[PDB]
UniProtKB/Swiss-Prot annotation, chains A, B:
It comes from Arthrobacter globiformis. PROSITE patterns: COPPER_AMINE_OXID_1, COPPER_AMINE_OXID_2. This is Phenylethylamine oxidase. Its EC number is 1.4.3.21. Its cofactor is Cu cation; L-topaquinone. Cu cation binds at H423, H425, H584. Belongs to the copper/topaquinone oxidase family. GO terms for molecular function: copper ion binding; primary methylamine oxidase activity; quinone binding. Substrate binds at residues 288-299, 371-376. The modification 2',4',5'-topaquinone is found at Y374. Binds 1 copper ion per subunit. Contains 1 topaquinone per subunit. Induction: By phenethylamine. Catalyzes the oxidative deamination of phenylethylamine to phenylacetaldehyde with the concomitant production of hydrogen peroxide and ammonia.
Length: 620, 620
């Protein structure tokens, strides 16, 4: 009966029925996004209203619509036509992936470029890449994809090893028109294959690895009820799934004694952007918002027992809508399991004679998505001791180019003739906090160094300082690894037994933020990425750090516009937005398939409990 | 037959026999350190000479000696008397732990302080704390310990919950004399107990945790030969053990094809210091060099199957010398096992139709040491993909004090009346590199941001810059998280197939370095801790970043004196010294026993291989 339950196939079908009857799902309509809306603040009525938000695209040139539907009442609640030149285009459709290649295959300019390189059109794959917003006035209000070409020598060939450099095309995917073909020069197509399953490349497979068996002879320690409600080692939460964001965590709480204490109301990765650092006009426009433009949840993989998730796995199979409103199951799309995590606490005491050891464990909730060449695993971890951690695992195939003869300052050489442009992978975590309830505040904590002198005669003292962020206009913060900077989210109205406000400390990895020039298109469209930490006052419609319609939006929406309201955040319902990412200078070892690299953040209790919360863990 | 084999009990016994016969092990002598010496550079003779270094203390006031012995030839090679006022005192002896408490228990000044607090002398434990070097001229050349008192209410009581603040004493442990008793005022002894095994404190133990079984039905994938030689998934190395440093890794190499490629010649944690940040004269002198003053390897725990190390565990039981030269086995002192480590690489390709997933694993080598209230686990990890990682796990009981009425800028309150002074845990890793051999160099790599303009019209480009460190005087480097700073160790004479020098990249955690005032005693004695990275030219006698005799040494020895030689390090036999640590502001959740916190570093291949080295890993 939970309002945070996953969408069902029947709910999807009812939504389609409602849209159809209203005249909103004609044969030229496509659903570009469908997702359930969270309950509004003040769900204490239990007047459950399951509401869905829908973005409806029109393949015939008519204006798209944003529609809110109530499956509970069977009505359309609102339906607005969108001026996409103003508010941005709808996310890319899966069915548009193929359209770029097919439109180019008949264009005489495209064929002339390929013929000059002696490339058979039937072998040339064209990547469907989001356009961004640059200097081409004719693209305003048109639905544009850009195309970069890769040669497949045979149908099982990895095309990424054969980029066609010096060539790019722009396609209006609604009017079905090739607006520009730009050929800046011929580059050799790199010839080596990158087929990581070819025995000629792998050599004989290792015969030395022996199996690691992980079993739980009595079953797992967590329980799932109502489909998506988890109880594990005093943790309680609901696992949601949204086609744009992927796995979403709701109602994260910890049972401390007889009392259920909230910690986080909603946690998600609300955006992720991959900006490229190559100034070549072939690629200098290239910035993919995997979450906002492509929707990472709709590309979630089906996870295989023993290969993707090892041990005693409980799966969730979330349901999403296809372009026509039909329900589709992502079978085994979410893995859940607990893992041993080494030593939790240990002490051998010289004076009492007591030897004490306890083991740690963590609950893992994860999914894996594939968007073109990239593959990303999203991992949420809950530990016995109250720690919450997020980890992104980046793998797949790096995006390639030619390596220019005579080298490059912005591209790594991976193989003869083959390059990999520098780029970043930048994530935005949206943490709707509820530390013991909704009256929360954020403090910036810095280490303080002290000078030798009176009161510090031996020059050993050091301290810390905490600065309360009181208004949104001062709540845009930068990392400072040197001063050990962290941020504490506390509840000034909830004190622990020492009469200090309860809190959680955010520990960042302090990786570089957005490197692009502050005057660039990408710095305006991904403004969230230029700073490590933002705090806003909660509001229903402030969901994404980039705004609702990221595709071809000209910039400024999202966080910079929210914080301009300068709302009070000192002991209020607040949301923490944390930017974190990887700066990727590709190495030879990343080729022809990338070993996983990771980045993340974590939150640890900071006087939330009255003492260690793991005193009641038994010996193994 | 390996010269890197662990010391045997027979070797220890022969060393004792040799010292005895030479007149160097009389009844008033104590062995304060005994360890095998690594082979000198140029072991290509195989003229194996097992040599041992010994520090010999004299409990009667005679000068201690440093002695080098050859078990291979059965002779004393050299024996030097030490002027400890000049070169420093010998490390603390285990048998001196009890002496501080016993000398104080008869001192009238100590008894007067305790009587004023109504404390029964028989209940008062006195921690044996290293003295450092401060303003007390009478301590120069005397062997001093300082004492801080803790009350045990009964023999199984945790004394740490009952610190006796405002009282400290200094003891000359050779002449058996209490030199000073300082009573700065009475503080209430905190009354709450901290007995983490008391049911009244733990409550009923959890009954919800279900077992995780980790087995290897076919055995582990690694092999151990010659006692301590490891072969695992193309890795090769020898596991050494030294009573001062603990686990030492020798000859780390990777089998790439038919060729054994060196990477690291010797890896160890060569020093670790815990400076305290409380300016109270009771504690402002407090800085423990766990490695240099106490010798962390001699306090290694015996690790229990199922509790400390879980899975298919292979143990090493290293042998050390007791104070009289007898061999003592540390049973099950080192755990070795492989662990599953999630996804190694994954891609589902839209164009080839190939779905690819491989799992990662890591080889774990670990030990756990206990020095007083602190417990530390040292973990070395080898991954399938060439990554080497170190992780320190800090746990145990925090060092306590009274919490002053009216608060403190330098102490955290843990319980009513009970405080925990701020401190750091700072480690020094000594990495004797051998990237494809001994001609190595270090480059500092920074991200470079570029301005929008000609050649970068869209303002998206970014780059990187590498600076070669050519002489020791420029090879003292600071972290810069903001510019993504890392360090690359390469071999300019060994190129990969793209004609670039092979290399490994050091990724630091960029935590704060030593916070103390640069003019402080601790900043001079732990100079290594003030900077993140040092590079020296290799030399046999340059083993520790603090010098050979850390106890009561007045400062300057070690790294600052080494680098003053300003030797060439551009393509030479070099050693990387990396400083890393935790800055610990204790939280309520750290009490009464600390959940593990971690810090570390890692090294990843940087064009060392000609492509991903894990293409030959099979599917699970
Ligand atoms: O992440 C988006 C870049 C991309 C998208 C689709 C195919 C290839 C590359
Ligand atoms: O790490 C050394 C501090 C210490 C040493 C021995 C007993 C208690 C505390
Ligand atoms: Cu990347
Ligand atoms: Cu600590
Ligand atoms: Na909130
Ligand atoms: Na070296």
């Amino acid at each position: 009966a939970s309002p945070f339950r996953l969408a069902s196939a029947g709910e999807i079908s009812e939504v389609q029925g409602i849209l159809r009857t209203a005249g909103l799902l004609g044969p030229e309509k496509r659903i570009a996004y469908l997702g359930v809306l969270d309950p509004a603040r003040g769900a204490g009525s239990e007047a459950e209203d399951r509401r869905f938000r829908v973005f409806i695209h029109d393949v015939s040139g008519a204006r798209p619509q944003e529609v809110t539907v109530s499956v509970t009442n069977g009505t359309v609640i609102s339906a607005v036509e969108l001026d996409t030149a103003a508010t941005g285009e709808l996310p890319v459709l899966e069915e548009e992936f193929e359209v770029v290649e097919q439109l180019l295959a008949t264009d005489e300019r495209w064929l002339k470029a390929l013929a000059a390189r002696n490339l058979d059109v039937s072998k040339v794959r064209v990547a469907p890449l989001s356009a961004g917003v640059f200097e081409y006035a004719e693209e305003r209000g048109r639905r544009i994809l850009r195309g970069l070409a890769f040669v497949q020598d045979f149908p099982e060939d990895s095309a990424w090893a054969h980029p066609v450099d010096g060539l790019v095309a722009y396609v209006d995917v609604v009017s079905k028109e090739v607006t520009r073909v730009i050929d800046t020069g011929v580059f050799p197509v790199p010839a080596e294959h990158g087929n990581y399953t070819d025995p000629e490349l792998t050599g004989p497979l290792r015969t030395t690895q022996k199996p690691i068996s992980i079993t739980q002879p009595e079953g797992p320690s967590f329980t799932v009820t109502g489909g998506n409600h988890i109880e594990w080692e005093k943790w309680s939460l609901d696992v949601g799934f949204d086609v744009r964001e992927g796995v979403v965590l709701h109602n994260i709480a910890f049972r401390d004694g007889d009392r259920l204490r909230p910690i986080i109301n909603r946690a998600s990765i609300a955006e992720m952007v991959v900006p490229y650092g190559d100034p070549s006009p072939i690629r200098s426009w290239q910035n993919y918002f995997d979450t906002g433009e492509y929707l990472v949840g709709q590309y979630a993989n089906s996870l295989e027992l023993g290969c993707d998730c090892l041990g005693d796995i409980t799966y969730l199979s979330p349901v999403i809508s296809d372009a026509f409103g039909n329900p589709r199951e992502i079978r085994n799309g979410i893995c859940m399991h607990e893992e041993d995590w080494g030593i939790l606490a240990k002490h051998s005491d010289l004076w009492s004679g007591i030897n004490y050891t306890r083991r740690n464990r963590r609950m893992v909730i994860s999914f894996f998505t594939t968007i073109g060449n990239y593959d990303y695993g999203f991992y949420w971890y809950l530990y016995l001791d109250g720690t919450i951690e997020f980890e992104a695992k980046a793998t797949g195939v790096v995006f390639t180019s030619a390596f220019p003869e005579g080298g490059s300052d912005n591209i790594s050489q991976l193989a003869p003739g083959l390059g990999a442009p520098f780029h970043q992978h930048i994530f935005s975590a949206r943490l709707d906090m509820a530390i013991d309830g909704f009256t929360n505040r954020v403090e910036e904590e810095d280490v303080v160094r002290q000078t030798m002198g009176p009161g510090n005669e031996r020059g050993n003292a050091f301290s810390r300082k905490r600065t309360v962020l009181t208004r949104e206009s001062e709540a845009v913060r930068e990392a400072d690894a040197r001063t050990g900077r962290t941020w504490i989210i506390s509840n000034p109205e909830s004190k622990n037994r020492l009469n200090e406000p309860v809190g959680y400390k955010l520990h960042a990895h302090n990786q570089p933020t957005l490197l692009a020039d502050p005057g660039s298109s990408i710095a305006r469209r991904a403004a969230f990425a230029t700073k490590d930490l933002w705090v806003t006052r909660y509001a229903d419609d402030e969901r994404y750090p980039t705004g609702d319609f990221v595709n071809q939006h000209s910039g400024g929406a999202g966080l910079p516009s929210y914080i301009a309201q300068d709302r009070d955040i000192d002991g209020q319902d607040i949301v923490v937005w944390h930017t974190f990412g990887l700066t990727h200078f590709p190495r030879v070892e990343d080729w022809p398939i990338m070993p996983v690299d990771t980045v993340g953040f974590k939150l640890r209790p900071e006087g939330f409990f009255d003492r260690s919360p793991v005193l009641d863990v038994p010996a193994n």
